Every structure is written in C-alpha cells, then in structure tokens.
C-alpha cells in the first residue's frame, strides 16, 4: 500500500503486489502487479533501466495454452459466485478480450513483434521464440516450468484481489519480517556476471561492425579472425571490478534491482577492535531512505 502508485498511472490505484524473484545465481529482478481502478491488473516490470507494462491477462494466456474458463475457475474457483471477485474477474477478462487475440501462438507472436527491439535477442532467427524468450527471461525468473509460473501467477492475482477487498492486511516492506540481507560475495558475483555479459555484447557488436563496414575480414571459420577481434576490443574487466571496489559507483547497464547506485563499499578502519567488528556485522537500508525524513 504505497500512495506513489496513485499518481503514477492515474487509472491505477495504491494497492499493488510486489515480488522480487531471483534466479539460481542470485541475480534477482522485480515485477509488480498494479491493480488499476478499472479492474484489470497490470504486470509492471523493469528491463534496461526502463519500466514496462503489459496486461496480466495477456501474459496469463501467453504462458500456457489456456482457455478463459480455466483462468476464471483458477483465480476464483471457490464458493461459486463470490460477488466481488466474480465481477472483477469478469471485467478483467472482457477488458482483455477488447483488443487481443485468442490462442497462445497469436499472443506470443504479437508480444515478440512488440518487444523484439529492447531484448538483446538474435536479430534473424525467429519471432515467436522471442515471445518465449520474454516468458522465460522476465516474467517470473525464479520458476522454471511454464505451467508453474502460470499457477503462481493465478495465486498472486488472487492475493491482489483479496488485498483490494480488505480481506488481507498490507505486508510492511519497512520491517525485518519482509527483509533479507545481501552479502558481499553475491553482489560481487552479480557484478562479475554483468561485466561478462557486457563483454560478450561488446565483442558481438565488434563482430557486427567488422562485418558491416564492407567486408574487411569476414571468416567465421578462421581462428585468426577471432584472435583479431579479441585483440581489438577491451579485454580487461579486472579493472572494472577493481574500480567498483575502489570507489563504489556500481556502473552497470542494468541496476540488478538495486535502488541506489553509490556507496557500496566501506573502508575497514582498524582504528580499534570494536570498530573492525562493527564494520563486519552491520547492515544498511541505503540513503534513498535517508533523504526522506520520516
């Protein structure tokens, strides 16, 4: 229950459901459910520093080969005909029926043709697999099996609708009930994976530009070509990590779901023993809250 939601999407409302889902490599990103005044639910998420908003019925149908009776009897299959939930789900189903298409393939193709630009996906291969690439890489990353992402999405939308009707209290994000700690080495691994992914994208852009010029050297079978290209680009990522440690300004193309991008490292002043320990134990919430005096 955060009021900044309200003036965000004016058809929107303060009620939302947030989930920070994390892959096996501890590389989480967020994707929240906005409950909009009209009745439908938006599936907000983040990619490349940019918000992105696709309706939840869209990806619900795009995820599994589903028919609408299944969505309904999954969200509110209970106590047949509970007033509030029943009319809200009806309104949602029809509001999606408005413009979209019927099957899973059509939805995936539309989704790909919409989102092929921002995904770093292969330019030439195909179009529906890009929709599958979204529904693998962004939607709910902690889960592997599609049907299970579908089940958890139904449960989550049911929790949102229960929260709207006042049958569920608002969990408090500023309390250790709903908090965990990020260690050092896990952040180190995230930044190392980000630098490696940038390195791959960089040698990929170098190969594309080499091919693009006219054709100075294009031998994708010759190992000599790969030695040439590796020698071209900056091959030193040790200094990137060493800079993150020397300064703290986490300079990455994607924030890895981190609010603040400065102040990550403290210098272990061994001035006194208690000072050293107290360095090792402490935690912090980030100055993004310090700037708000409350």
């Amino acid at each position: 229950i955060r009021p900044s939601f309200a003036n965000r999407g004016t058809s929107y409302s303060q009620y939302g459901l947030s989930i920070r889902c994390v892959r096996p490599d501890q590389s989480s990103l967020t994707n929240t459910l906005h409950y909009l005044n009209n009745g439908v639910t938006m599936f907000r998420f983040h990619w490349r520093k940019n918000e992105y908003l696709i309706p939840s019925m869209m990806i619900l149908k795009a995820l599994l080969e589903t028919s609408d009776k299944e969505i309904f009897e999954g969200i509110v299959g209970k106590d047949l005909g509970n007033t509030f939930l029943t009319d809200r789900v009806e309104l949602m189903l029809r509001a999606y029926k408005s413009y979209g298409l019927y099957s899973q393939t059509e939805t995936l193709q539309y989704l790909g043709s919409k989102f092929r630009v921002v995904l770093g996906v292969a330019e030439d291969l195909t179009d529906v697999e890009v929709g599958r690439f979204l529904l693998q890489k962004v939607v709910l990353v902690h889960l592997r099996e599609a049907k299970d992402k579908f089940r958890l999405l139904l449960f989550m939308i049911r929790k949102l609708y229960a929260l709207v009707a006042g049958e569920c209290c608002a969990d408090n994000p500023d309390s250790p009930q709903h908090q965990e700690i990020l260690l050092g080495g896990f952040l180190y691994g995230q930044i190392l994976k980000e630098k490696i992914e940038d390195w791959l994208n960089s040698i990929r852009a170098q190969i594309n530009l080499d091919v693009r010029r006219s054709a100075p050297g294009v031998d994708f079978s010759d190992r000599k070509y790969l030695t040439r290209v590796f020698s071209k680009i900056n091959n030193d990522i040790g200094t990137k990590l060493q800079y993150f440690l020397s300064t703290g300004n986490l300079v990455s193309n994607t924030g890895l779901d981190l609010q603040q991008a400065t102040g990550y490292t403290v210098v272990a002043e061994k001035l006194n023993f208690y000072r050293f320990l107290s360095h090792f134990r402490m935690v912090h919430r980030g100055a993004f809250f310090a700037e708000l005096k409350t």
Binding site: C169, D171, N172, Q177
Partner: protein, 523 residues
Amino acid sequence: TIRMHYANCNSYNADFDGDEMNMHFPQSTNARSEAQFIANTDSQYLVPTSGDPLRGLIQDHVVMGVWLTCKDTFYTRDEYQQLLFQALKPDETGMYGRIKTLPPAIQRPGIYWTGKQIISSVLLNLKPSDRPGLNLKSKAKVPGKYWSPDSEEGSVLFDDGELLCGILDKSSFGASAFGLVHSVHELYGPDIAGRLLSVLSRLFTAYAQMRGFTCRMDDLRLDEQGDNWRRQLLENGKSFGLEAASEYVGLSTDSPIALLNANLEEVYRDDEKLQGLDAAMKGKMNGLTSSIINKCIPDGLLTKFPYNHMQTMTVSGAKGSNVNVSQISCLLGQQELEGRRVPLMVSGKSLPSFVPYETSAKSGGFIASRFLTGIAPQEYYFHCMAGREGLIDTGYLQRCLMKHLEGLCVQYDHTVRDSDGSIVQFHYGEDSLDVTKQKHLTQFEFSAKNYKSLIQKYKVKSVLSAVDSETASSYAKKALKKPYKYDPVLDKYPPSRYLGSVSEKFQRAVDEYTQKNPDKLIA
C-alpha cells in the same frame, strides 16, 4: 587551553566537552571602550526575551549552598576567617583595604559563627560606599516541608544585608529572578552583581574543599519498608491491564478468553480503536505509577532529605528532577513512544515473548523494574524502542525577521521608526523597556521595602534639576478621570523629560498597591 568561569556556560550554551570558541580582539580604542562599557559580560545578566536572568551558579555551587546555609552548620573562628578570605580574595580584584566581619552568632561555651553569617558577611564586604543594606523576602527552591513539618527555612528573609532566615539554592542565586543575586543586580548595579556571583562561586568551592559532597550508593536503595510497599502496590496492580482492556472493549473481567480475544482481534486491525485502547490503559497505568511514586520516594527511601546526597541534587535543583529519582528508585512506568504505546506486529503480540492479544500491562510497554534493581529483557526492548525514538527525534527564520528589521531603531523623539524614516510604533511597545530594565516595576513591595538605596541609585538631586516634574504628574490624574478627551500622558507629554508621564496601567497598579496593601507605606 583558555579558561573561563562556569557562569558563562549557561549563556554561551556550551558544555566544555570539545566545542571551541572564536576569541577576537578589538584593535582600535573606540572598539575596546564600547566593548568594555556596552557589551561587557557582567552587563549581560538579563536575556532579552524575558526578564528572567541567565547567568548564575550551577550544580556544585548550589548543592553546597543548600548544605552551607542550612541551620545545623557551625564554624570555629579559623574556618570562618579562612572561608571568608577564600571567598573575597581582594588583592586579585582590588578596591578594598581591610576585610571586616560580624560578631559571632553564639558566644559561649565556645564561639561559633554560623553559615548564614558567612553569607551575610560576604554581602557586608561587597556593600558599596554608602548604600543601605539589602533587605528582601523571597521563596526558596527547597520546599519548606522537606526540612520539617512547619519548618521555618522555606523562604529567605534578610534585612539590612544579613541573612536572617532561609537557605540559598537554585532560586536564590542562579537562573532564577527575584532572588539574592538579581536583587543585588538591581540595587548595587551590574558590576557588583558580577563580583558577588564570583564571590559566591569561590566561597562554595572552598566550602566543598573543606567538606566535600558525593552521590554514593545507599542514596538510592529503598529501605525494606519502602520496597515492600512498592511490592505490595505492584502485587495489587498485577492485573490493571486486563481490567482496563476489558472495560474498554465492553466485556467484564470474568469473560471467556476466546470472546475477548475475538473482540481484541477486531479492535487493532483499525487505528482509532487503538487510540482509545491505549489512552484508557495508559490512564490506568499512570494512575498506578503516580500512586507508588507518591507513596515511596518521599518517605520510603533510605536516607532523608539533608543527608541523602541525591535528594539534595534533585530537590535543590542542581541537576535532575523528581522523575529521575522516581526511575532510579521506584519504577519506570509506561513507555510512551511517539504518543500511544508499543507498536503491535502483524500477529497482535507485542513481542515474540508474549502470547497473541496479550492484555497484561507488562506487554503494553509498562515496565515495573527500576534502574537500581535492573530491567528484564522484554522490558529492556521497549525501553530501547522509546530511547532510540527520542534520538531520532532530537536556520532560515533568522534571515526573514532580520532583513526587514535591520534598522528598526528607537529614534530620539522616542518613536520607533524604520531607518528609511517611516514610523512603526510611537512609544516603542508601550515604552518602558524590553525586559532588561522593566523587571522590578511589578515588585512594588521590594522597591518600597528599602527605598533608601534606590533614591541614591537614581541620583535624585541631579535628575530633579533639569526635567519637568509638576506638569505631567498633574495631568496624569486628569487622565485617570475615566471619561475621554484626555489622552494617555505619554502621547501628550514625552516620557524622557516630563517626570510625571508614565503608562496608564503602571499608575493603576501603583495606586492599587498604595491603597490596597500599604503595610510598608505609613498611612
């Protein structure tokens, strides 16, 4: 490290803990002349906001004051002379030739000067050339009942400059008006109030070196009857929490646990119903707390007022308050964090130690243990909550009211104008003065009490010469004729030269005193 005296610690708002101070030097001689006469420290005895003085002695001096002026004290000749000379120390200050004393209060079988005689002696050595002694009557800080039932000390009375009855404490000399030092500032001028403040400082320090004063352990411990009284009151109020909660929600004390639990669960999902519940239960707990405090701290604890070395520092006003000995000796009471009380987590239990919807006040942040004996974990957590709340609780409005009020000076025709020439007030705020020189006008008993020093302070024979006396005084009575068509005397006649012209309410008050309680004024 530069050294300054304690008196200024209250003025500079300093703590001598590491904060440092710019120290300038006015080069030219005009600047040092004006610093010496206008803005010198001994002339800064009155803050500008209210009349209440800000300089004056602090913790140690005032506790040793309660212990020196007390009437069970006695000195032989040696201690009297020595302590007096430590107080005066003429040579470093100057202006005086030989130190003069009093006769002893008692003379046989052994000669003994008493403490009040030492205070009177200091006052006698600092009297100017020809100003009759000080005489004064004023309530003191240490209440009269602490010494005895129908005790006499209570309130200092001293005539012609000799401390006749009463003891000096934070109200007498210090950050409290209408005491000894403020009345010396009024009668004998500022630079004598400064000398007197210094002399009291050194006198009380020297007495400390003779006697010494310490806050030992047994000052805190409750005598067995006291702490068993506290134990009985706590066993009695074992269940005030449940009574107040059940009365609030509507049920009786003998209700089934399940129904009370259901109603409580319905209560603090909301927020207003919490306001009501915490208000009721807080009223109950504070009734209990005030009860056991009122029964314990005056009489329960081990040593009585004079000897208890924390009862002195507390009720004399040096450092601390009555709530402090309450907490160190009797109980802590409700832990009020930002108003109501402890925040209830999702499951309705105040802390993971307590069962859900727990009613007993120990879960409401009321903690019964005292600092002397030790607070338990569940209590210590709420105490950390309240304290850290305080710590997260603990300059542009000085460039708004100052840019526009730069000049705003009181021109010579006595009409406070802005410097561009335009009027803002006639007779600046109903003139007499900002607090500095207007404190004692309401003290008609004091001015009329002695009256022989005030005529010499005003220098009547030089003032009555060149200022007008009959005209405004005559027209004042006609202005006191209730019907209109006679303006206030200040408007017709300026108050600087026409020595009858004074504000209306001042005339009304001086006349109501002269007619009402003239017990000093003969007929």
